[PDB]
Amino acid sequence: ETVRQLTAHVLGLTAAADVEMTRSFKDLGFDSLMSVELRDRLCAATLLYDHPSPAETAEFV
């Protein structure tokens, strides 16, 4: 539940169910600044380049 939430708000979506763990981070509209912001936000609760898929990062938490 740490990927559906805490990431849709960063992307600016309204509902957490609008994200799909099938496309790459770049395919979702992620740049260096957004990657840094996502890492900083997830740290409270280059790792994105190592695993460019939300599904892969989901299993880590």
Partner: protein
């Protein structure tokens, strides 16, 4: 060297596609309505951000012109029978003519802000979306920017710099400051009509929209087996020069441009059956254009030359209007028919049509002899362009990125099949085109049947793998169904 056109896309008031534009022009209707006087694009604050992999925050501050041009390019690529995924890391050039930044004007009254308000990226983003290695530039010559971009793309194709080119323009009226400036300049028609070559001419009306076309060399198009919509023979760009006034056009410059472009194209008089006028409906430009056309093409003709302008239907689109006119010519080169021109009751006394051997097309009549047409675009600064174009010499699978998108695509396919244009296409050709000329997305829906009725019924019912070896001639198919969501600054 001739240039072959293999596809086109457009977005105009009351015309979201080439078929809609042809229906509007043939019916003799006008899309100029009241402000929700001018042509409008029925909401421009909607975009499919997920299709192009753009975050909603980025798309919110992005210029809607960029989104419109991206959608137009995708539609043109889909309608040309070329899979965009096969165009990656290729020498594909993009030439878009933009001369308006109303979105930046509204915004100036983030980090992707600067990025979303740059005029160059309007083309560059396409090179980012398609992964093309060809040149990408934005030209600004006024109201003839699109034709200049088309000429530049043709020259680049001739020189071998680019293999496939995308050429066109866009113009969206959003900020009221532009309208205030235009009204202050004193060029808007008080009644909001474009009386092209008419005695009631008192200005022009403003329109918005955009268009794009795909350009490739004739030899490569014939070698690749592509279907040719039209053949551009020659093009030329010049300037008015030492005119009486910076705004006043020059007749001699237009005459020289026409003479040189028709000498380069190799087409003599009595061979061109239609000329697309600039048609601003002004009291000065129209007589000059008529005199130039009569001196160049009017003379030495046994029959009057038919003329017309597309601004009488949708209005003046400024930097984009030019390519729109060319699109109209392309339609007139595909259906072999002419469409009427509105806002014409009596000849202009300043325009001696009898002496100039010109006549305004005001009825729908078949076109008979190959057919050659010319499109002219004159900028207010003094830049003039002319383009001469002649006529060209059972399971069903659909794909989409969303179940709602899949249902919309199935419904649109069923509607197109119910259309007579779809009826003229055999089911085998339709299936082969869907399997080959359409990209395979994530979500897939495959249907089976015996005849057209069964497949159409199944497609409506569900609306609410190497298939090449399984299966002809390539046929046009409806484009992608975009799921647009509101995106605006706040």
């Amino acid at each position: 060297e001739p240039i072959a056109v293999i596809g086109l896309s457009c977005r105009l008031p009351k015309a979201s596609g080439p078929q809609e534009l042809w229906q509007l022009l043939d019916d003799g209707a006008s899309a100029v309505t009241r402000v929700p006087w001018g042509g409008f694009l029925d909401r421009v604050d909607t975009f499919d951000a997920g299709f192009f992999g753009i975050s909603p925050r980025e798309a919110a501050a992005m210029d809607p012109q960029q989104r419109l041009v991206l959608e137009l390019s995708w539609e043109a690529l889909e309608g040309a029978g070329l899979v965009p995924a096969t165009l990656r890391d290729t020498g594909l050039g993009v030439f878009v003519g933009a001369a308006r930044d109303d979105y930046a004007t509204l915004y100036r009254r983030d980090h992707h802000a600067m990025t979303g308000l740059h005029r160059s990226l309007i083309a560059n983003r396409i090179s980012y979306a398609l992964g093309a290695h060809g040149p990408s530039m934005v030209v600004d010559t006024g109201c003839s920017s699109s034709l200049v971009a088309v000429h530049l793309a043709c020259e680049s194709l001739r020189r071998g710099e680019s293999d496939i080119a995308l050429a066109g323009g866009v113009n969206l009226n959003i900020a009221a400051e532009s309208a205030r400036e235009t009204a202050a300049f004193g060029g808007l028609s008080p009644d909001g009509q474009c009386f092209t070559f008419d005695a009631r001419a008192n200005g022009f009306v403003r329109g918005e929209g955009g268009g794009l076309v795909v350009l490739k060399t004739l030899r490569r198009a014939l070698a690749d087996g592509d279907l040719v919509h039209g053949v551009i023979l020659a093009s030329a760009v010049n300037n008015d020069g030492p005119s009486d006034t910076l705004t006043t056009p020059s007749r001699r410059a237009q005459e020289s441009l026409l003479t040189r472009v028709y000498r380069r194209a190799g087409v003599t008089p009595t061979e061109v059956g239609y000329v697309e006028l600039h048609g601003t409906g002004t009291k000065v430009g129209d007589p000059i254009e008529a005199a130039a056309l009569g001196a160049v093409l009017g003379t030495g003709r046994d029959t009057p030359l038919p003329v017309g302008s597309i601004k009488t239907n949708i209005g003046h689109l400024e930097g984009a209007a030019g390519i729109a006119g060319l699109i109209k010519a392309l339609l007139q080169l595909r259906r072999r028919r002419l469409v009427p021109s509105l806002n014409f009751s009596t000849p202009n006394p300043d325009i001696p049509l009898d002496a100039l051997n010109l006549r305004v097309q005001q009825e729908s009549a078949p076109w008979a002899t190959t057919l050659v047409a010319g499109v002219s675009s004159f900028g207010m600064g003094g830049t003039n362009c002319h383009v001469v174009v002649s006529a060209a010499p059972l399971p069903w699978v659909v794909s989409a990125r969303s179940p709602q998108a899949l249902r919309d695509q199935a419904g649109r396919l069923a509607a197109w099949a119910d259309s007579p244009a779809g009826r003229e296409a055999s089911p085998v050709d339709i299936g082969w085109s869907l399997a080959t000329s359409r990209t395979h997305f994530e979500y897939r829906a495959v249907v089976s049947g015996s005849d057209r009725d069964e497949l159409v019924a199944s497609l409506r019912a569900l609306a609410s793998v190497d298939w090449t070896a399984y299966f002809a001639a390539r046929v046009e198919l409806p484009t992608y169904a975009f799921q647009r969501s509101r995106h605006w600054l706040e």
